Design a protein around this nucleic acid. Sequence first.
DNA 1: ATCAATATCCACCTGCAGATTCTACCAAAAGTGTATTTGGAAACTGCTCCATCAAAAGGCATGTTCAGCTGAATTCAGCTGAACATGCCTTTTGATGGAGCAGTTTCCAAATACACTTTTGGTAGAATCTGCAGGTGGATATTGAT
DNA 2: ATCAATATCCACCTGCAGATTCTACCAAAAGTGTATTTGGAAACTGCTCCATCAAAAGGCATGTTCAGCTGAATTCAGCTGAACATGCCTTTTGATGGAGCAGTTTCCAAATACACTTTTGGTAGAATCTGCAGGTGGATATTGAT
Lengths: 92, 92, 97, 98, 105, 104, 78, 84
Amino acid sequence: RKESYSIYVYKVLKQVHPDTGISSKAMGIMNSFVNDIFERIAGEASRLAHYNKRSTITSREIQTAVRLLLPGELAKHAVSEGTKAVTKYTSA
Amino acid sequence: RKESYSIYVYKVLKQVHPDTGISSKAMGIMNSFVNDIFERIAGEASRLAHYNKRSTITSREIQTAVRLLLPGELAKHAVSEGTKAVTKYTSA
Amino acid sequence: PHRYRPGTVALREIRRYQKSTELLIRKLPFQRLVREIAQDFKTDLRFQSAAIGALQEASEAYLVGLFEDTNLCAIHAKRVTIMPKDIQLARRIRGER
Amino acid sequence: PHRYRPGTVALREIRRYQKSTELLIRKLPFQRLVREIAQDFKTDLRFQSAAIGALQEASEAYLVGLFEDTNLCAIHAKRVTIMPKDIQLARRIRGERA
Amino acid sequence: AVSRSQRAGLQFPVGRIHRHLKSRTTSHGRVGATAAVYSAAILEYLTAEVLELAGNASKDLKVKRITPRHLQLAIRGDEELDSLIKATIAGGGVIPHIHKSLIGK
Amino acid sequence: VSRSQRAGLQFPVGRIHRHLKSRTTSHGRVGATAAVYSAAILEYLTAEVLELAGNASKDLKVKRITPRHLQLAIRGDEELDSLIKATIAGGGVIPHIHKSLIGK
Amino acid sequence: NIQGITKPAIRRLARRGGVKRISGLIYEETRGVLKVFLENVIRDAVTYTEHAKRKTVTAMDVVYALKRQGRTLYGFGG
Amino acid sequence: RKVLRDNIQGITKPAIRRLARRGGVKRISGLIYEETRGVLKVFLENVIRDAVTYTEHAKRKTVTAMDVVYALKRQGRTLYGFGG
DNA sequence: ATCAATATCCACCTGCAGATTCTACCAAAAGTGTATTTGGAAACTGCTCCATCAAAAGGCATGTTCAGCTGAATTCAGCTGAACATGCCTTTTGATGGAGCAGTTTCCAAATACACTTTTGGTAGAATCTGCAGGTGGATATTGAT
DNA sequence: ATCAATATCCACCTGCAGATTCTACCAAAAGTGTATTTGGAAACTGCTCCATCAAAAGGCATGTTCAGCTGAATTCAGCTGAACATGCCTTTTGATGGAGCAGTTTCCAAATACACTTTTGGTAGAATCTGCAGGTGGATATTGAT
């Protein structure tokens, strides 16, 4: 009944570190973490669209929101991944 | 075209200080103050609604938001004024 | 007979406690305190153990971080001993005032 | 010939400036500083005059507020002269970076 | 024909504030009839509190018109407004203060 | 045929869209790719934290990442540290002792 | 009750904080501060509790309260 | 145009002394003036970078006072008196 | 830096149990396919307001000199806070069983959203009042030499 | 103590810049209808809390001793504040052209909105296993003392 990002955090753990496990208290941290960045990114994106008298939060809002929220370098790569995932997904 | 809170700030001014004017820069400040506090209330109130899986923002949300944002004495008095106006309004 | 010099054990405890991560306030006295404070706001309250545990975590994280900034103010004054004026200055520059 | 003792004019100036509200940095050089920094981010930018007005008010608000904290750190060290290490202690505790 | 502001005994505009609540939240978001009223009420009360103290300040300086300096004096001088309003008032200056150590022995 | 798999992501694009839709606004709408983009950067960031956190645990020859390892990873990295000024429950602090406090 | 936050405990907290030597007056100072801390957080937590018409302060009510004082905590539901 | 450089030195020693005076500072060490310039520059970079990010997003070439007011709110240095 | 004798700390290896991970089914999303809406990018365009330029003039920045007094260095001794091994009161913990009461769920009255067609309040410039910004000139400190 | 030298008031004064009023369309607030939910409102679970008891086991409180640190007092090199002369560069007044906001319009590519089909992720019990926390004993760090 109560959803979580546990499943997906563990999946990501197994790519960068197939060897490694994660304790449940640590998994709690990653959860709080993913919820927090999600809510920051989401908040800034809504704000952006409102400042510009728009209504649809597009990936353009998200991207700018990332430039505003993430320290450069974390932001560079985060812009890559998103641009990647998006082009690859619009290829049918 | 561009709305403002000026004629209302001015009305309230005449009530407390019938003799006193307000330079336009001071009114600019007052406008920023009203829009600010409005955003904090509305923000806190929408978040309150979210934490309780409710989709409507009622006077009951606003009242909690005010208890959370306003310190001590300002809160007691703002709650009385809000309660008073609501029960006056709900008298058809 | 054996004694360590003033400061030697102190530095040992710094090293030990900066190494560990357990709560350093005792659970029960802390629970007593949280409940007493809460009673002044709403009566016959009940607390999730998770909520008491969050409060303690936040509290100790807060105090430990405040002791870091207090030490900096003490060192600023060519001391080695923190004093309440060190806590006062830190809280002032922090805006907790 | 008449000389005020070291520090007397200084207290006059605190009283003067704490009483006034005008900007204390000259406008033109500050406008220049803003356009220099802005340009090292994106070429061919313009500025509404109120945008530079906003930056200057915030900038002086920030600096005045930081000298208050800086001053508390100097006094805490039982000094009367603010120094770079005071500004550094202020900013460390403020959570600002460095 | 009467306005909702009037119906609540308020100067602040209830309709407009009801219309900004709809505008900003949530998605599937609903705003009650009395959420707007309650909001106009506390916006108006706070405006009154600030203008009450600001006005006193400018009477203490024998001038008729409130300026940002007066707003700043009022807010910094009131323990609770000072805590509520951690914003920068353009044009405001600061509250005159000189630490004792600095005053010439 | 799911949108996460289409975008080449581990993170749940569908769910992220349903959450975004619930953020803004009455009026509000949410682009197709916005959900994808968001999910993309949430995944990247947790990979970055788990990467470093993994190293911290290997450098202690343990298999399971704990909150200590997340704390050491995050505080020991300039940018993650800037980004995350949250409190990591049970992570403790980075060992550090001021020069002036060491014995002579 | 505040006195139940004992001196060796305050000692331990300071040690984690890098403190070598502690003035004898720090202990009463530290409790006053910890007390202002908990009062500010709990008041907000209880306000979230009452809003939800509950008699039980949940961990989420504290996590939300901490987020409002700008003391975000990871590990307890957000 | 003309090349812009060394404009931080346009924040003169007397301007910094005046700002310190409003901040209640009585005596100033000679090394304060270059510290202050350094700190002002980091302040302005951060605010202008964010402001310009708002400009670029909205596809404008002109930084508005709204861009600056939003940038400051992000940095937790909320400003009143320009906001419309 | 060696002599000694503490104690501390640091590997290496060890054994269970508290947590983790792997296994097996049921609903609420997540994905499809259709049918509308619609918001926001076009493509013109009216028209602020932003970048320049010019030009005159005094409000200030710059640079130097001179020495007052502040910060930094040094010495000292009173006494505050660290270390210690003692003695006991409080926290820890771990089931038990009762129970308060979060969290469901099922049900409809009130409260909300729409929606076409009213009426009015407030914004944008014109039109008039008028505070107050500093200009000036002497009475009241305030400061610093003697 | 007194002057002497400046700085600071504090009140009075007059048209200018900026404020308070005055006047017209447009968006928006209002009163009608009808159609849809929302989230109390009751009534009953099961969690999961509080309140027990009851050891043994810590971890705290207590008092003594003195190392060593903080604060006070003293000295002095020289950094920094005050004042002055000089003149540049900011300010201010006012134009010019036009770049580029921002106000209208059309109108597809992109969304919401169903209604069904099909999948996955959450829960609750199985099935190992990481590593806590315990042992040893080797080397280290600390402190007294030819």
